[PDB]
Amino acid sequence: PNITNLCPFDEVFNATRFASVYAWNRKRISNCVADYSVLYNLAPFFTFKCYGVSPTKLNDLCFTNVYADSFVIRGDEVRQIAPGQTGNIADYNYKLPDDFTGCVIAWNSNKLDSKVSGNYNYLYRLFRKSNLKPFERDISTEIYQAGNKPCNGVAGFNCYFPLRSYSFRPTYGVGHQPYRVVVLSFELLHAPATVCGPKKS
């Protein structure tokens, strides 16, 4: 075969703060090697519960472009992140295609992300009120007005700020904890494939 290459997977698998729910921070990894056993070694063993490609052959069957994401949510939206189901994060923050090739990875993050006071830096879009096409980002920081009354100001009745916050106090149980999900996705443009694992030809 060949001498292997360092790959920036750990760069999106280890950080002091991931992005919040309002902006799923994209990271277009291209021209790298495929190695995911360190992902298994990082956490105690869980199923990926992931849909596109089976996890026993993510090392082989290699691709042309991996499009990776980095965002932190609740465990109900970990089981609810699947394509076809809607909600509030799955509709108003981040939606998947129906032909979505690629699959998600989740793990618990009580020891890193959660703080005893409760880190309110992680916040989500609850009010966006437009059905979302798959794979685009919307940053509507400005206040919405409802009730057929022109608001256009700061802090009034029926003038709702669209970005409210998670609470991450560590005394809660499984289901309201922070979870860092790294949604890998592959698209096939029929380009020359630069992302592949160890092999000899």
Epitope: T86, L126, K129, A146, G147, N148, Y160, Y172, V174
Partner: antibody
Framework: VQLVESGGGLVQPGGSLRLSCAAS????????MSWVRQGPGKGLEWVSV???????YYADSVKARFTISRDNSKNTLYLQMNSLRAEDTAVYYC?????????????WGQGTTVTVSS | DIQMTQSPSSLSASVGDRVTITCQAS??????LNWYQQKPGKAPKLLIY???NLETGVPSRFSGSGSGTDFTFTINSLQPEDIATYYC?????????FGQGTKVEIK
């Protein structure tokens, strides 16, 4: 911002009407509407919630029997029933669901005392 | 489904005194929960936003605190216009479930 009762009368099993609740200027499509039921002598039971994205989430007891959509400009939510088994002799309360995360918004709506009997 | 349960069903004995009303859930939920007060034959009316806040016009002595599947609230003074019911409402974990019913009455 109040809500309007729209319904009544006596209906038979196998027949259904179109329940309606109107608004006083509140948007019904780009908001979060929700209806519940209240039987005589018993507690509330959740009927349906609709989001602004068009996500129809309703209870498993009434699966594939209730259809619900909001009007574009008349500010009235509509729901059509199918194949009523006469257990819903009750009063159906219309609202928007009362809080997103934290607000002083709280308004409820009046509902009509429908009955289903042969 | 979440089993919304309450044991102290009928606190008609308290007249201007301590109320120890509570509700419980089957699975572990956080503070995402509200209670209601439904007048007999009329619409419900809200008192608590998300287990830690209070409604705009109410007496201030209403105070609720609960975390980890046991949720607690008190009415230490029973003014005579509170003669109605009180229901427990879990949300944000579908399906949203209601309590069976709590009854208060003044003698």
């Amino acid at each position: 911002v109040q809500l309007v009762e729209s319904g009544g009368g006596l209906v038979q099993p196998g027949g259904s009407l179109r329940l309606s609740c109107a608004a006083s200027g509140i948007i019904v499509s780009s908001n979060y509407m929700s209806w519940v039921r209240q039987g005589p002598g018993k507690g509330l039971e959740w009927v349906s919630v609709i989001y602004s994205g068009g996500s129809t989430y309703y209870a498993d007891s009434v699966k594939a029997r209730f259809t619900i959509s909001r009007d574009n400009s008349k500010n009235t939510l509509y729901l059509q029933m199918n194949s009523l088994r006469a257990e819903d002799t009750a009063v159906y309360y219309c609202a928007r669901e009362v809080v997103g995360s934290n607000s002083n918004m709280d308004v409820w709506g009046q509902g009509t005392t429908v009955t289903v009997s042969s | 489904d979440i089993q919304m349960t309450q044991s102290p069903s009928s606190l008609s004995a308290s007249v201007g005194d301590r109320v120890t009303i509570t509700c419980q859930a089957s699975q572990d939920i956080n503070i995402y929960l509200n209670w209601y007060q439904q007048k007999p034959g009329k619409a419900p009316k809200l008192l608590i936003y998300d287990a830690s806040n209070l409604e705009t016009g109410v007496p201030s002595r209403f105070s609720g605190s609960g975390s980890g599947t046991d949720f607690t609230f008190t009415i230490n003074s029973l003014q005579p216009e509170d003669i109605a019911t009180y229901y427990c409402q879990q949300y944000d974990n579908l399906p949203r479930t209601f309590g069976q019913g709590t009854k208060v009455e003044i003698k």
